[PDB]
Paper text:
Compared to purple CPs, only a few blue chromoproteins (BCPs) have been characterized: the Rtms5 belonging to the pocilloporin family, the aeCP597 from Actinia equina, and the cjBlue from Cnidopus japonicus. Some sea anemones that belong to the Stichodactyla species have a naturally blue look, and these sea anemones could be new sources to identify new BCPs. In this work, a new BCP named [name] was isolated from [name], the giant carpet anemone. To investigate the blue color-determining mechanism of [name], spectrometry was used to define the optical properties of [name], and X-ray crystallography was used to determine the [name] structure. According to the optical properties and crystal structure of [name], structure-based, site-directed mutagenesis occurred. The results in this study showed that the single mutation at S157 of [name] could alter the deprotonation state of the chromophore and lead to a blueshifted maximum absorption peak in the [name] absorption spectrum.
As a member of GFP-like protein family, CPs have a barrel-shaped monomer structure embedded with a chromophore, and each protein monomer can assemble into dimer or tetramer structures. The chromophore responsible for the optical properties in GFP-like proteins is composed of X-Tyr-Gly and is able to form an imidazolinone structure through an autocyclization step, which involves the residues in the vicinity of the chromophore environment such as the highly conserved E215 and R95 in DsRed and the E222 and R96 in avGFP. The imidazolinone structure, together with the phenolic group in the chromophore, forms a conjugated system of π-electrons that is regarded as the cause of the excitation and emission in GFP-like proteins. FPs usually adopt coplanar conformation, no matter what they are cis or trans orientation, while the non-planarity results in the non-fluorescent property of CPs.
Numbering used by the authors:
A (entry chain A), B (entry chain B): 3 to 61, 65 to 231
């Protein structure tokens, strides 16, 4: 009860260091193959005076290839849908909070996103546009207080060859009650967001992502643990 | 120039919430298979009034199966060796600092470890000794300041079914000069430390680990990145 191919519509509203903007996205994904493409236009407040990379991971967790029979908390949540709240702390003091709602309308995923960022250094790589996109990352996921939690570390490539790192904490909340859901055991999700193309003078980004839900298979347990 | 079969000698000393302890370990590893085993004896401050799990990840990064031809910063550093410094911040306020010196004598690796932990909640899982070992984890590794940096998030299982999480930051420092080293690109390492057995009335822990160095292979790049 999510189709194997869907449309995506997203609407973002936010502020980074008090610079307000809006975006709208139109795209498509394959929820069970874990692949998706979004064409994201900054409709208000652009071209942005800061790196678009900081917005990228706020623009799709129902689209994930879940391996090893791990229960899919997101796909299970339809038709009701879900939401999430995230906090991102950058190692240089940048601090980004976000809230998102996800619903499904026929074959269209609809996302509403609020992002507020503060305390980004004025002369850091984000405010100066010196960043070159994200490394892939792995997010840990586990159940806490009856909902799903995630955390990950991410690394942003910089022009000079450094990485700028951050820590993400997400609470995912199904709009179904807990007793209607099969909850997963502790596991991981890998993510790989990439900007494929920038046009309209920085106002139109084509962004691809793939994500995979799995246990750790590289290192087997001697105790039969996942 | 590190043998396929090595002995491990490790010596750890420190205090957690002002509870002094000391440990000696004897063990063995296969540096290219990424597998190892330490038999860890608590020789002072036993029986530990806190969970031994918080010590576990401080007891071996020369032992890693490196895939995809990634340059091995640690195996390259012999015969000179290397050291590391780490900080671990637990989500409940617990805070642990550590430093370590690693040398190779014949086929014997020798570790000297200093570990200091403070601000651990008195009624938290660690000090109540109510943890059940670590989930496997994924560390990101990248170059900074001419040395190697690592970061990870780890998750401790608790008796009540919850997880207590923490963030690690590690600076790894070769004793070879940089111009003698082939530096790796951004990559990951998976680690899985497990307690296989406990004996001598709780003063002897047998601890197994496997580590794998790698890129993210589950989510292919569309831009030809690793």
């Amino acid at each position: 009860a999510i189709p194997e191919n869907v449309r995506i519509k997203a609407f973002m509203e936010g502020a980074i260091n008090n610079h307000h903007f809006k975006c709208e996205a139109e795209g498509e994904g394959k929820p069970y193959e874990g692949t998706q493409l979004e064409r994201i236009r900054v409709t208000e407040g652009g071209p942005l005076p800061f790196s678009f990379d900081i917005l990228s991971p706020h623009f799709s967790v129902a689209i994930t290839k879940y391996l090893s029979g791990i229960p899919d908390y997101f796909k299970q949540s339809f038709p009701e849908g879900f939401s999430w709240e995230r906090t991102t702390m950058y190692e240089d003091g940048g601090y980004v909070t976000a809230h998102q709602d996800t619903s499904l309308d026929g074959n269209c995923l609809v996302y509403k996103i609020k992002v507020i960022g503060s305390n980004l250094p004025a002369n850091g790589p984000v405010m100066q546009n010196k960043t070159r996109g994200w490394e892939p990352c792995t997010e840990m996921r586990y159940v806490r207080g009856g909902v799903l939690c995630g955390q990950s570390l991410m690394a942003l490539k910089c022009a000079d060859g450094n990485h700028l790192t951050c820590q993400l904490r997400t609470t995912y909340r199904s709009k179904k009650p807990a007793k209607k859901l099969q909850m997963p055991a502790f596991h991981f999700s890998d993510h790989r967001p990439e900007i494929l193309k920038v046009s309209e003078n920085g106002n139109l980004m084509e962004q691809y992502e793939m994500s995979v839900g799995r246990y750790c298979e590289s290192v087997p347990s001697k105790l039969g643990h996942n």
